[PDB]
């Protein structure tokens, strides 16, 4: 519902406006740099397992800061929690926030990264190397 948004902004000061639907994911077309068993390369894929929330300034201005909450597996969910707890104290590590929110009869785990930007650096490099 709406309380999901009230959990996402968690404890800081947001002023958060949804960036899509209600409480589900949002498709985007973003440049990835991927290598595994099947696909390999630097190409524009279409990412769809995140929820985006854009931060509102005072004066109800829209500021360049997005809360990106990803919802994915449970087994992966802790591994990332452990490694974050290890690297927590670095200055360059985007502040994470791990929780579990129930939708239907499931407390599905979410991992929210805070105060990130619209475009990553892969997007800059792609846009400047494949220029049309």
Provide φ and ψ at 71, rounded to 5°: -120, 110
CB atoms within 10 A of CB 12: 13
Residue 9 near residue 67, CB atoms below 8 Å: yes
CB-based contact 27:48 (threshold 8 Å): yes
Summary count for the chain: helices (H), strands (E): 3, 7
Contact 28, 48 (CB under 8 A): yes
How far is CA 18 from its chain centroid?
13
Q: What angle do CA 55, 94, 50 make, to 5 degrees?
A: 60
Which contiguous run of DSSP H or E holds residue 54? strand 50-56
Burial per residue of 15-51, b for 16 or more beta-carbon CB atoms within 10 angstroms, e otherwise: bbebeeeebebbeeeebbeeeeeeeeeeeeeeeeebb
């Amino acid at each position: 519902a709406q309380s999901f948004l009230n959990r996402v902004c968690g404890v800081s000061a947001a002023r958060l406006t949804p960036c899509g639907t209600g409480t589900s994911t949002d498709v985007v077309y973003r440049a990835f740099d991927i290598y595994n068993d099947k696909v390999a390369g630097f190409a524009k894929f279409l990412k769809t397992n995140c929820c985006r929330f854009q931060e509102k300034d005072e004066d109800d201005n829209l500021i360049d800061s997005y809360f990106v909450v990803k919802r994915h597996t449970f087994s992966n969910y802790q591994h990332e929690e452990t490694i974050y707890n290890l690297l927590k104290d670095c200055p360059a590590v985007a502040k994470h926030d791990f929780f579990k929110f129930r939708i239907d009869g499931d407390m599905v785990p979410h991992i929210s990264r805070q105060r990130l930007t619209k475009y990553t650096m892969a997007d800059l490099v792609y846009a400047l190397r494949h220029f049309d």
